[PDB]
Amino acid sequence: CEAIYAAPKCRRDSDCPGACICRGNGYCGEAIYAAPFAR
Numbered sequence: 863c864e865a866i867y868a869a870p871k872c873r874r875d876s877d878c879p880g881a882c883i884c885r886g887n888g889y890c891g892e893a894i895y896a897a898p899f900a901r
Contacts, residue, residue, distance in 0.1 A: 863878065863880060863890050863891060863900065863901050864885075864889070864890075864891040864895070869887075869889040869890070870889060870890045871888055871890070872884030872885070872888065872889055872890045877890075878891075879900070880892075880899075880900030880901075881899055881900035
């Protein structure tokens, strides 16, 4: 769920869509970008 323009911000990993985690940028994104699961 990584996006640059329309990036969903995170508070906690759980508030990230799909299975995304709260990345160190402050936004939600998948754990492994190479892994197609829930980006």
